[PDB]
Amino acid sequence: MADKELKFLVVDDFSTMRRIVRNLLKELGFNNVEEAEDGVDALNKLQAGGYGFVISDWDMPNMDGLELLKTIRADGAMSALPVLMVTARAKKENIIAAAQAGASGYVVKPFTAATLEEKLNKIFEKLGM
Ligand SMILES: [Mn+2]
């Protein structure tokens, strides 16, 4: 995956979290990044088209990460979009629910650029990108 212009949507209700993830992506060379504050905001943005990767918080108001993921996977145009879930604490049941709903990966925050890079690269490889 040599497309540094892959367009990311970073979804989290905390502005600081979104900024952290944006800055880590920038460090890795991914600068084509947009932000959303909950699952509905995310879906509104995704409808505009052109997105290549979603990084979403698990716990958000109004529409949480699991519901956002399910909606993406049920969308014809976006059904195969990579979705990496972010959580403050790994839990077996959450990991399995996310997998059942089609998550591409799951990562615990706080994380470093090297940790994000490994998550992204393993997802790109798994998906044949
Ligand atoms: Mn949150």
CA of 15 to the centre of ligand 1 (A): 10
Technique that determined the structure:
X-ray
CA of 128 to the centre of ligand 1 (A): 30
CA of 114 to the centre of ligand 1 (A): 22
Query: Which amino acid does the sequence have at 45?
Result: K
Per-residue DSSP letters for 64-86?
-HHHHHHHHHT-TTTTT--EEEE
CA of 13 to the centre of ligand 1 (A): 5
Instruction: State the number of CA atoms in the 13 A half-sphere of 83 facing the CB.
Output: 28
This structure's resolution (Å) is 1.5
CA of 57 to the centre of ligand 1 (A): 6
Q: Which residues contact 95 (CB under 8 A, 6 or more apart)?
A: 106
CA of 22 to the centre of ligand 1 (A): 16
What are the residue ranges spanned by the domains of the chain?
A: 1-129
Which DSSP symbol is given to 46? H
- The domain 1-129 having CATH identifier 3.40.50.720: the answer here is no
Q: CB neighbours (10 Å) of residue 64?
A: 16
